[PDB]
Amino acid sequence: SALGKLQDVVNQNAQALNTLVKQLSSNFGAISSVLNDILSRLDPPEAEVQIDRLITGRLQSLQTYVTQQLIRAAEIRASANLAATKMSECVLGQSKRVDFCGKGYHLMSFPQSAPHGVVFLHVTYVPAQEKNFTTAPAICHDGKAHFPREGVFVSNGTHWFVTQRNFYEPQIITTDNTFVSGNCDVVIGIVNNTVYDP
């Protein structure tokens, strides 16, 4: 049941073809549904009246089939354009669009062929094993605010560290991962702590 989208198109096309074929078993108000019978049982002056109704019916059926086929080909073209954009933005390069090439942080996609379709193997990065940590926007060492450069200030309860935003890697808060900007009485939520100078 996984390859359902690819099978639905085939089923719709088969149903359309079968209906177009079965539309030839109708008389549309005539005496028969076979032109051979009408032509071998009636004279040309009187058989055209019966042939015109079949012609009108079959023409209407064929026009309906062509209209439905164009409407379906529009959706198929939209899906093909989406698949091409995905192939260009996730197989030939890493993407940053959320929920565009899988759930999680996109890493790489692998193209795989399929009957009248394409299957993408989206390798994603899903974080796990969360853990609670108390945090502060910055710190006050000598009356100045030390905002982090790339990370977040966390504390295990007693000591303050600086780690990443997607993976817990505690490091000593030094003046190489934090920048000083402004005083220490304008930011709400700041916590006093020491900054190590190598």
Partner 1 sequence: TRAGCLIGAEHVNNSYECDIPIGAGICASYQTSQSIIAYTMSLGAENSVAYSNNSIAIPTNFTISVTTEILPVSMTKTSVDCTMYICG
Partner 2 sequence: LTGTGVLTESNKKFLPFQQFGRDIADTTDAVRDPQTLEILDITPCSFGGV
Ligand X SMILES: *[C@@H]1O[C@H](CO)[C@@H](O)[C@H](O)[C@H]1NC(C)=O
Query: What is the contact surface with its own copies in residues (CB under 8 A)?
Result: 15, 19, 22-23, 25-29, 52, 57, 60-61, 63-64, 67-68, 70-71, 74-75, 77-78, 85, 88-89, 92-93, 95-100, 103-105, 126-128, 130, 132, 135, 137-138, 145, 147-148, 152, 165, 169, 179, 181-182, 186-189
User: DSSP code of 165?
Assistant: S
6 binds ligand X (CB under 6 A): no
- 3-state SS class at 136: coil
Beta strands in 12-64 (DSSP E): none
132 binds ligand X (CB under 6 A): yes
Position 174, amino acid: T
Position 86, amino acid: K
Contact of residue 156 among partner 2, its own copies, ligand X, none (CB under 5-8 Å per partner type)? ligand X
From residue 16, alpha-carbon distances to 8, 19, 20, 91 in Å are 12, 5, 6, 35
**x/- site string to partner 2, residues 12 to 31, per CB under 8 A?**
---------xx-xx------
Question: What is the strand order of the sheet 191-192 is part of?
Answer: 178-183, 144-148, 139-140, 191-192
24 binds partner 1 (CB under 8 A): yes
